[model samples]
Target chain A: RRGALIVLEGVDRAGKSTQSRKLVEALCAAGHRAELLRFPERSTEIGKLLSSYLQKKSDVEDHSVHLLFSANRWEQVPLIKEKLSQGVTLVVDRYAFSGVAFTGAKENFSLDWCKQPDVGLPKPDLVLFLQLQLADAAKRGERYENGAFQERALRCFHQLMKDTTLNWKMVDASKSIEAVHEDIRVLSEDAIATATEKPLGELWK
Target chain B: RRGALIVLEGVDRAGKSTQSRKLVEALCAAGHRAELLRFPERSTEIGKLLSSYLQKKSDVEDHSVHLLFSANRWEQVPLIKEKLSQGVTLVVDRYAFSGVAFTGAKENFSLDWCKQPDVGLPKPDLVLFLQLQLADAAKRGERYENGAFQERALRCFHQLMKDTTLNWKMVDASKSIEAVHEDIRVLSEDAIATATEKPLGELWK
Candidate 1:
């Protein structure tokens, strides 16, 4: 039987990554095989380039950097499918959702254009979006945060959720970490149960 | 069972593309399915960008352009593998070979660095190198003859052949078109006759 693909997404400081890790741990303790995969996965060759762009240590055209990020995702897809086929559930931290929102936030880019490079990529079985307000996130003081850009990114994320066909579950990220983590655990268990209960379809149409 | 992947490589005026096309045509005529795929394949969105660089209409930094070409190849890889799994013969005019040779020929790139992006792409079953004398290639030139870059490109072609691990055939591209065409036919027949042939492993390994 094929394993399920589960994605965790949201703005920076939303604690999706931490929550994703916990969910993967719980799945394993329950005897279901699960793996955690991350975006801008810095270990890959293209990921090295993405790191340069993100850290602002190197300069690449905005569009070029975004394409590289999406291409990096494409390279990892076969591995994702193979593991799924082997009954190893994949719990991903961020993915095409953030790829679109983050890149589409830039000038001269559209949500559609950001979606192009990702068209044939593996569609997530569920995309858990940790939604947080700008004020709340700023209070969190994440290292990568900037007030104005974060505002823009949040607006873009909301707009992205409306426009995409991806499966999504938006949790209020302003809540306490324990509450958000529990919400993720409950939702993840439900998603997994539902996945095992039904027939699966090809990720992308 | 996985299908065959056939690749053809050579310098300008070597008729490598033509031979690849003819082989694809013959394979389809024999009731075996096939598709002709070409690199710097100018149809996709990213291809348009690389096309500008190739035509000298755009000035992308060397490192950026090199990565773009690799990205372009990567964007199509999944579909190529999907076609092959469906028993479609894939006739590739170029793949990672050009990505390595064209960019590796430029100053500042090593062969190993050039081979990195193609690490996990589907391996080809055979690679046909259309060998030709630089002197004999003059007839196929129109404005393509006005410069010496073709000679440089030819040398790069030879270097790429030496660097790859694909099962290879060297066709005398300097011969008459009929002879070149016949050689391609025979090689493709051999490829078809021996479905048990081991695939060409990771190129530039």
Candidate 2:
């Protein structure tokens, strides 16, 4: 039986890390084999370069950085499949959603262009979108720490929600952490239970 | 009158740089407003990152590096359009052809996937493909310094020639420098003379 790929999506400071870990713990506690993963994994060679760019230690053009993020995900495809094949659920911190949303916020980096790279990667069974207000999501002293840019990214995220045919559910992240986690848990549990019935599908195929 | 976008493409050691510069000089000597450009522009913010990856000072995954190459070109799209609109010909050393060819030769990167990032970039009016044998191209000690990868890249380039509607001319690069230059000079002159009659088209549009 294949395991579900559950993705947690949100802008910076939306509590995705905390929620994702909680989700994984809840899944494992409920007897589902669960594991944690994050985009720009920051461990592989590709992810290392991405980390440098994200940390401002290096600079890359918007489109290039976007693709690097996608590449980071692509490198994990085999492992993702292997784990899922062994009935292990993977709770991804972020996926194509963040890759496209953040990069598409930049000038001249089209949403479609950013999307092209990940069209055929593994698709998630469920996307628990942690929704927060731009003002609420901001953290001081962070790069790209602007409401206007967050607004643009938010627009892209919503557009993706509307446009993509993925299993997406929106959660009010402005609520307490437990409230958000509860919503995600219900959705993920249902998806994980049914994951074995359907063969894994390719993203945007 | 608009200006011609002339592209020269081939694998490494195929004399693309020398031939492209010579072609630009020839165009200018003939009273044409010509400029030289190259992909992996290596000067802009994106290009700097690509340069680092190429020099092995930094590591990037193949797909990420491939998209970086495309982004390097995308950043130049505005300037490319502006130059042509101002009737200044661009004699390019490499373009999307090399990007797709070189990267697509690697494992897991589909030819179509490699071509995706460049879909709407400015199309070349003419492509001068300098053909050379891999054995002929080897310079004793270099990576990808063999026939295997070059053969794969060559196949992708030829496939692009057949699949795409761009004007492509296959040149025998084994000839002397002057001979190859003469062939390119004639074709470029004809292409440049008629550049303004047709509207500029998009790559793979």
Candidate 3:
């Protein structure tokens, strides 16, 4: 049986990092082969440039940075594909959704254009979107940390979800951490079971 | 007055380097500020990654490599723009046309998709395509070094020219070096004058 591709996405500090780790930990404790992966993997050559660009250490153009972000995911696709095939469920912290949302949030950016490089990525079997009010999330100081930008990014994320038919759930991230944890646990467990019997799906196909 | 962005493109070893340099040398000797530039510049961080990928030293997906190549160009956009605005003609060895042609030659690839990353690149005032027979060019061992791939890449280049309304001139590269150089000299000098009074154009809108 194949493993599940469970992705967690939302504004910064929406507990994505916390929830993603917890989901992986719980899945492993339950004897499921699970692991965590994050976007901007931040170690490879492409990642190094992306990191520098994010820190304003590098002056990459918005469009080029967008493509580099897509390439960063692509660099790990074979490994991601292999791990999932070997029955190792991947609890990805952030994936293409974040790429499109953050980059698409830029003024006059086209969500459609933002998506081309990631056209055939591995689609998440379950997408856990931690929903939180902008003001509450603003306290977190996002990477796309600007409040106005975060709002547009969230809107872009919503539009992406509306356009897709994948298994998506919007979790109320403003709730207590324990509450969010329980909700994600249930969703992730079900996703692993559902995906085990199904072949992996490609994104934006 | 802005400078002309003169671009030279053809199969690998089609004398793009030889002609690009000679054109620059002649222009400078004649009191014109001409500089030579080639793609996959092989210097910047992105350029380094692109070189490794080309040498088969790195394992990157075809799509990812295409984007990286575009990123390399994007990295130089500001410099290219600055030089042109300062009245220094840029005799670029290869530009987006080569990017789209080589990558688009791959089976099942879309030229339109290949062009998206380079959508807003600075348009060339004089796109001097050194036309040559594939077999003669193949004797030079192209980067897409395989004959089948070069043929397809050539077809893509021809198609791009057919679809564009830019000032493109096809020079028969089979001629002697001196013969080809004289032909390029006239075309380049005229391009410089014509583009002096005109604003720089953007590629693919």
Off by more than 4 A, model 1? A141-144, A196-204, B1-67, B70-205
**Residue pairs with clashing backbones, model 3:** B142-B145
Q: Write the per-residue lDDT of candidate 2 for residues B65-133, one digit (tens) a residue.
A: 776788778778878999999999999999999989888888877888889988888889999899888
Q: DockQ of each candidate's interface versus the true one?
A: 0.04, 0.40, 0.63
CAPRI quality band, candidate 1 = incorrect
* Model number with the top lDDT: 3
DockQ of 2: 0.40
lDDT of each: 0.73, 0.84, 0.87
Considering every candidate listed, which one attains the maximal TM-score? 3
lDDT of 2 at B180: 93
Query: Which ranges in model 2 have alpha carbons more than 4 Å from their true place?
Result: A1-3, A11-13, A28-33, A42-61, A78-87, A105-111, A132-152, A162-165, A196-199, B1-3, B28-35, B41-61, B75-88, B106-109, B132-143, B196-201
Per-residue lDDT of model 3, residues B52-91, tens digit only:
7777787778878888999889879889999998989999
lDDT of 2 by residue, A107-179 (tens): 8777877788889888899988898877777641144667888888888998899856788888898888798
Least accurate stretch of 10 residues (summed lDDT) in model 2 chain B? B137-146
Q: How far does residue B166 in candidate 1 sit from its true spot (Å)?
A: 37
Best by DockQ: 3
Candidate 1, after superposition: displacement of residue B98 in Å?
A: 11
- Per-residue lDDT over A15-126 for candidate 3, one digit per residue giving the tens place of the 0 to 100 score: 9999999998999999999999999899888898888888878677887898899988988999999999999999999999999999999986788888888887898899
| Residue range with the least summed lDDT across 10 consecutive positions in model 3 chain B | B137-146
